[PDB]
Design an enzyme around this catalytic site. Structure first.
Site, PDB file in Angstrom:
ATOM      1  N   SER A 102      32.379  57.933 -65.226  1.00 53.79           N
ATOM      2  CA  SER A 102      32.745  56.674 -65.850  1.00 53.79           C
ATOM      3  C   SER A 102      31.890  55.562 -65.257  1.00 53.79           C
ATOM      4  O   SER A 102      31.037  55.823 -64.417  1.00 53.79           O
ATOM      5  CB  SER A 102      34.215  56.388 -65.668  1.00 53.79           C
ATOM      6  OG  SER A 102      34.572  55.142 -66.253  1.00 53.79           O
ATOM      7  N   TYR A 135      41.587  56.732 -59.987  1.00 49.74           N
ATOM      8  CA  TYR A 135      40.698  57.169 -61.052  1.00 49.74           C
ATOM      9  C   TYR A 135      39.242  56.942 -60.662  1.00 49.74           C
ATOM     10  O   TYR A 135      38.391  57.775 -60.965  1.00 49.74           O
ATOM     11  CB  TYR A 135      41.028  56.429 -62.349  1.00 49.74           C
ATOM     12  CG  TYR A 135      40.070  56.696 -63.501  1.00 49.74           C
ATOM     13  CD1 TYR A 135      40.025  57.937 -64.130  1.00 49.74           C
ATOM     14  CD2 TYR A 135      39.238  55.696 -63.987  1.00 49.74           C
ATOM     15  CE1 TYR A 135      39.171  58.179 -65.194  1.00 49.74           C
ATOM     16  CE2 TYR A 135      38.382  55.924 -65.052  1.00 49.74           C
ATOM     17  CZ  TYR A 135      38.348  57.168 -65.657  1.00 49.74           C
ATOM     18  OH  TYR A 135      37.509  57.390 -66.705  1.00 49.74           O
TER      19      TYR A 135
HETATM   20  N1  NAD Z   1      36.401  54.400 -72.846  1.00 46.48           N
HETATM   21  C1  NAD Z   1      36.846  55.613 -72.534  1.00 46.48           C
HETATM   22  O1  NAD Z   1      37.736  56.180 -73.191  1.00 46.48           O
HETATM   23  C2  NAD Z   1      36.218  56.312 -71.366  1.00 46.48           C
HETATM   24  C3  NAD Z   1      35.337  55.600 -70.565  1.00 46.48           C
HETATM   25  C4  NAD Z   1      34.750  56.215 -69.478  1.00 46.48           C
HETATM   26  C5  NAD Z   1      35.042  57.531 -69.192  1.00 46.48           C
HETATM   27  N2  NAD Z   1      35.921  58.244 -69.972  1.00 46.48           N
HETATM   28  C6  NAD Z   1      36.203  59.661 -69.632  1.00 46.48           C
HETATM   29  O2  NAD Z   1      35.960  60.453 -70.783  1.00 46.48           O
HETATM   30  C7  NAD Z   1      36.732  61.674 -70.692  1.00 46.48           C
HETATM   31  C8  NAD Z   1      37.439  61.915 -72.003  1.00 46.48           C
HETATM   32  O3  NAD Z   1      38.431  60.874 -72.199  1.00 46.48           O
HETATM   33  P1  NAD Z   1      39.018  60.583 -73.662  1.00 46.48           P
HETATM   34  O4  NAD Z   1      38.896  59.123 -73.963  1.00 46.48           O
HETATM   35  O5  NAD Z   1      38.458  61.580 -74.628  1.00 46.48           O
HETATM   36  O6  NAD Z   1      40.572  60.900 -73.414  1.00 46.48           O
HETATM   37  P2  NAD Z   1      41.394  61.791 -72.362  1.00 46.48           P
HETATM   38  O7  NAD Z   1      41.051  61.378 -70.968  1.00 46.48           O
HETATM   39  O8  NAD Z   1      42.831  61.770 -72.762  1.00 46.48           O
HETATM   40  O9  NAD Z   1      40.780  63.239 -72.660  1.00 46.48           O
HETATM   41  C9  NAD Z   1      41.112  64.308 -71.751  1.00 46.48           C
HETATM   42  C10 NAD Z   1      41.739  65.444 -72.518  1.00 46.48           C
HETATM   43  O10 NAD Z   1      42.034  66.515 -71.585  1.00 46.48           O
HETATM   44  C11 NAD Z   1      43.385  66.891 -71.698  1.00 46.48           C
HETATM   45  N3  NAD Z   1      43.849  67.294 -70.377  1.00 46.48           N
HETATM   46  C12 NAD Z   1      44.490  66.526 -69.437  1.00 46.48           C
HETATM   47  N4  NAD Z   1      44.784  67.180 -68.342  1.00 46.48           N
HETATM   48  C13 NAD Z   1      44.307  68.462 -68.571  1.00 46.48           C
HETATM   49  C14 NAD Z   1      44.319  69.633 -67.788  1.00 46.48           C
HETATM   50  N5  NAD Z   1      44.841  69.700 -66.568  1.00 46.48           N
HETATM   51  N6  NAD Z   1      43.752  70.745 -68.314  1.00 46.48           N
HETATM   52  C15 NAD Z   1      43.219  70.667 -69.540  1.00 46.48           C
HETATM   53  N7  NAD Z   1      43.157  69.628 -70.369  1.00 46.48           N
HETATM   54  C16 NAD Z   1      43.724  68.542 -69.822  1.00 46.48           C
HETATM   55  C17 NAD Z   1      44.122  65.693 -72.291  1.00 46.48           C
HETATM   56  O11 NAD Z   1      45.311  66.081 -72.949  1.00 46.48           O
HETATM   57  C18 NAD Z   1      43.059  65.130 -73.242  1.00 46.48           C
HETATM   58  O12 NAD Z   1      43.102  65.734 -74.530  1.00 46.48           O
HETATM   59  C19 NAD Z   1      37.647  61.508 -69.467  1.00 46.48           C
HETATM   60  O13 NAD Z   1      37.144  62.257 -68.367  1.00 46.48           O
HETATM   61  C20 NAD Z   1      37.640  59.992 -69.223  1.00 46.48           C
HETATM   62  O14 NAD Z   1      37.902  59.662 -67.866  1.00 46.48           O
HETATM   63  C21 NAD Z   1      36.517  57.642 -71.062  1.00 46.48           C
END
Ligand code: NAD
Ligand code: NAD
Lengths: 259, 260
Positions: free
Chosen positions: A145, A158
């Site tokens: 991130s 986080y």
């Molecule tokens: N603007 C943003 O949304 C943003 C910005 C920077 C980084 N990120 C990163 O992008 C990635 C994806 O985030 P996102 O926005 O798609 O949503 P998110 O973080 O909810 O996606 C993660 C997915 O993994 C699943 N999950 C959670 N715990 C789990 C486990 N123990 N085993 C398996 N699956 C599990 C969740 O149900 C979800 O579907 C994350 O790592 C997040 O930190 C997102």
């Protein structure tokens, strides 16, 4: 071959790719000819995912797997090795955000966040490396991130995770780069998700604040991350290793818009 | 001159794991600057050894047997120091472990341990000392990072991941509690000349040669080299220094290396 962004015949596993960033990356991987797999925490979330992949004409191999459960991951990998083939492209997307003032945050909560966002990427990478080391070809893209560089209030745990994942990237590069394994990282800026749709309604103080910090002067649509993701999974980025590729729209390079 | 006072007169200080080594040097130096020194270790034997050495330098260290991954125990340790010695002003998260295992061969239990002690614990301990600091609107939290906060190596996978996370943890405690006049910075030791590593500097050794190559200063850093920086980050002179990892490497991170 130095310019082939094709993922033809490459097995790909994007953790947590039922929706959101992971879905966009997995969708784009399929689009480039990759045999796409994904997983999530329960059957409901997998079924929703499978349906959406099907809906774009994609035969996603979904699995219910907790990424902090090593035995379960070990199994999931061997199942994909059996049914689909040995994994070539790992994307540690799966992760959780938690907004709690650090002094008020339970030790159990902090540990959870680290476990899923940091330790799990370890566990999953550990499982897919023996395969890659044999065939002497692999990609491991960790989704970091902006919190890999900058802190904010509440997101203490986080950030600690994402900053740790950043080094984990650099270490998997260090240790397994000689087997022609490229472990890089993608650092999304402010992504325009459905959840954040309210914040772009009528001059909103937040949207104004984000467009100030962003030189590109806008939020990034998740699909903006797919180009970069494909690039790091492609054979064109074989010389890119241990690198965090920030896709921020200029934020980390910009001090900010000042009156 | 209060912008140039490196004195720690009447400041309570807790250096985790400071029975020996870096933490010991930092604590000894803190005492020397007039700090009321506290430390802790994992068992009574290591505390007693520590207490002996502090006593041998004319230092009244307040030793405690505490595991830093046990939040309740830490919570207790802090309140005991609050009672007997005073509310903590200077935290140094020194306590930590190194583990050299190929990542793919490493047990998930091992990996977690290293993270727990080197990353999560610093959170727990910082969590316990922050309420005190936030009240009095003055505090110092110095996390001992490594060069592994920037660079990876074989085997030290988990350890790197931890230290890289601790680096951000440092930046976040700066972000979140900076407004209460709490400065959370970090110290990043280079190749330190410890007693354990004494063999590696005997008779042209390939390792010593490799280290002196990578190091512009062309030598190993004696632990006491970290003390000056440590005092500086604990002092009131470094009040504007916040969220900063002060690498004390002898130039290593700035240098591409000595090449034939
Ligand atoms: N603007 C943003 O949304 C943003 C910005 C920077 C980084 N990120 C990163 O992008 C990635 C994806 O985030 P996102 O926005 O798609 O949503 P998110 O973080 O909810 O996606 C993660 C997915 O993994 C699943 N999950 C959670 N715990 C789990 C486990 N123990 N085993 C398996 N699956 C599990 C969740 O149900 C979800 O579907 C994350 O790592 C997040 O930190 C997102
Ligand atoms: N060359 C080096 O030695 C070097 C270089 C860079 C960074 N560092 C870091 O500097 C710090 C100090 O290094 P060092 O060699 O002085 O010490 P160390 O790495 O030998 O261990 C620090 C101390 O913490 C204690 N400890 C471990 N787990 C504990 C727990 N759960 N609760 C309480 N105490 C615990 C140990 O008993 C030990 O006395 C560590 O964070 C280390 O990673 C060391």
């Amino acid at each position: 071959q130095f310019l082939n962004f094709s993922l033809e015949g490459k097995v790909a596993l994007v953790t947590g790719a039922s929706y959101g960033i992971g879905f966009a990356i997995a969708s784009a991987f399929a689009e480039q000819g990759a045999k796409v797999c994904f997983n999530d925490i329960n059957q409901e979330l997998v079924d929703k995912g499978m349906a959406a992949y099907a809906a774009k004409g994609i035969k996603a191999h979904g699995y219910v797997c907790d990424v902090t459960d090593e035995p379960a991951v070990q199994a999931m990998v061997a199942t994909i090795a059996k049914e689909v083939g040995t994994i070539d492209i790992l994307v540690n997307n799966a992760g959780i955000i938690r907004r709690v003032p650090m002094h008020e945050m339970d030790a159990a909560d902090f540990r959870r966040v680290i476990d899923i966002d940091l330790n799990a990427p370890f566990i999953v990478a550990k499982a897919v490396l023996p395969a890659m080391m044999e065939k002497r070809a692999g990609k491991i893209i960790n989704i970091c991130s902006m919190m890999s560089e900058l802190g904010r209030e509440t997101v203490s745990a986080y950030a600690a995770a994402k900053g740790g994942l950043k080094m984990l990237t650099r270490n998997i590069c260090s240790e397994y780069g000689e087997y022609n394994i490229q472990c890089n990282g993608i650092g999304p800026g402010y992504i325009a998700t459905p959840q954040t749709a309210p914040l772009r309604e009528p001059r909103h103080p937040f949207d104004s604040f984000i467009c100030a910090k962003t030189p590109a002067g806008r939020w990034l649509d998740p699909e903006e991350l797919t180009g970069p993701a494909v690039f790091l999974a492609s054979e064109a980025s074989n010389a890119v290793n241990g690198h965090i590729l920030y896709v921020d729209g200029g934020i980390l390079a910009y001090i900010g818009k000042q009156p």
